[PDB]
From a paper:
The TRAPP complexes are nucleotide exchange factors that play essential roles in membrane traffic and autophagy. TRAPPII activates Rab11, and TRAPPIII activates Rab1, with the two complexes sharing a core of small subunits that affect nucleotide exchange but being distinguished by specific large subunits that are essential for activity in vivo. We report a cryo‐EM structure of the entire Drosophila TRAPPIII complex. The TRAPPIII‐specific subunits TRAPPC8 and TRAPPC11 hold the catalytic core like a pair of tongs, with TRAPPC12 and TRAPPC13 positioned at the joint between them.
However, in the regions of TRAPPC8 and TRAPPC11 located on either side of the core the local resolution was suitable for de novo model building. In the case of TRAPPC8, residues 350–660 form an α‐solenoid of thirteen α‐helices that includes the site of interaction with TRAPPC2. TRAPPC8 (yellow) is formed by thirteen α‐helices and binds TRAPPC2 via helices 9, 10 and 11. The less well‐resolved C‐terminal region (residues 660–1,319) forms the arm that connects to TRAPPC12 and TRAPPC13. This part of TRAPPC8 is not present in the yeast orthologue Trs85, consistent with it forming an armless complex. The interaction between TRAPPC2 and TRAPPC8 encloses a total surface area of ~550 Å with the TRAPPC2‐binding region of TRAPPC8 formed by α‐helices 9 and 11. Conserved regions in TRAPPC8 (Pro559‐His567 in α‐helix 9 and Trp600‐Ile607 in α‐helix 11) form a hydrophobic pocket needed for the interaction. In addition, α‐helix 9 contains several polar and charged residues, such as Arg562 and Lys563, that are likely to interact with key residues in TRAPPC2, including Asp46. Interestingly, Asp46 appears to be particularly critical for the assembly of TRAPP complexes as mutation of this residue causes spondyloepiphyseal dysplasia tarda in humans and disrupts the TRAPP complexes in yeast.
Numbering used by the authors: 355 to 385, 424 to 661
């Protein structure tokens, strides 16, 4: 009840003395490189605005050496954090941030660094409306690092690529179903299912039933057991084998579609 916020306000305004103690501790610290980055990120928990820039600078200079570049990587992303409390944000620093991923990706194969580096890129460029860049570097990320992480990152990068402009859903659609397979493979069901649904809706928005027909044969395999049959039935019906140049397996497939629509007709009649 009220006691929580009472102790909360008192503890916050006693931590202001505590953060002052830590400021004294770091002013003592300036008098190792790991000590420097501990200094940085500790006062970044309450986020020093310019000491951000000086930690940025010092970390860059020294961690040119000491080729364990998590120091320097984390340094420039906390420089991006500074850019959040920096109106100019020296927007080329964002370019620096892009730099951050591509080289440091290769520096260490601990992919999580690449992940949240790209995520900070995502958010900060969303603070610039120019999502195109992070769209491209997220799509160049998502091919790799997994077949599962590849999938949810495929849709992340995908909808993000669509964040800048509504149309050109094309490669969006392609890789999001070519990852919806992996979604059915190793993903929590609600996210994979929202994959399938949003992908299919994006299909219908600008129809192009050619590859949608085979992905709707997949809709059917999840409809021959779980989903509704009529959607697959009408999907194959609009393909309409003669004049659509279907193939031997496709004719057999629409035989099976006749089987499913037979189930549907029998259940209706």
């Amino acid at each position: 009840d009220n006691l929580r916020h009472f102790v909360q306000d008192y503890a916050v305004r006693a931590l202001i003395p505590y953060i002052e103690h830590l400021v004294a501790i770091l002013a003592e610290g300036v008098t190792a490189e790991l000590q420097t980055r501990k200094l940085g990120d500790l006062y970044f928990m309450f986020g020093h605005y310019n000491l951000a820039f000086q930690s940025y600078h010092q970390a860059k200079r020294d961690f040119n050496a000491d080729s364990a570049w998590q120091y320097y990587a984390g340094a420039l992303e906390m420089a991006a954090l500074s850019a959040f409390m920096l109106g100019t944000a020296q927007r080329k620093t964002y370019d620096y941030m892009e730099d951050a991923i591509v080289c440091y990706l290769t520096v260490c194969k601990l992919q999580q660094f690449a992940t949240r580096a790209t995520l900070l890129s995502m958010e900060c460029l969303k603070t610039a409306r120019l999502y195109s860049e992070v769209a491209k570097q997220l799509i160049r990320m998502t091919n790799e690092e997994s077949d599962l992480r590849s999938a949810l990152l495929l849709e992340q990068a995908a909808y993000c690529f669509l964040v800048t402009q509504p149309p050109m859903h094309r490669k969006y659609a392609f890789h999001i179903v070519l990852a919806g397979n992996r979604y059915s493979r190793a993903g929590q069901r609600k996210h994979a299912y929202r994959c399938y649904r949003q992908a299919y809706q994006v299909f219908q928005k600008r129809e192009w039933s050619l590859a949608e027909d085979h992905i709707q044969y997949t809709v059917a395999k999840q409809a021959y057991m779980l989903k509704q049959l009529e959607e697959a039935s009408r999907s194959f019906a609009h393909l309409l084998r003669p004049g659509s140049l279907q193939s031997a397996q496709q004719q057999t497939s629409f035989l099976k579609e006749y089987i499913q629509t037979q189930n549907e007709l029998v259940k209706r009649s």
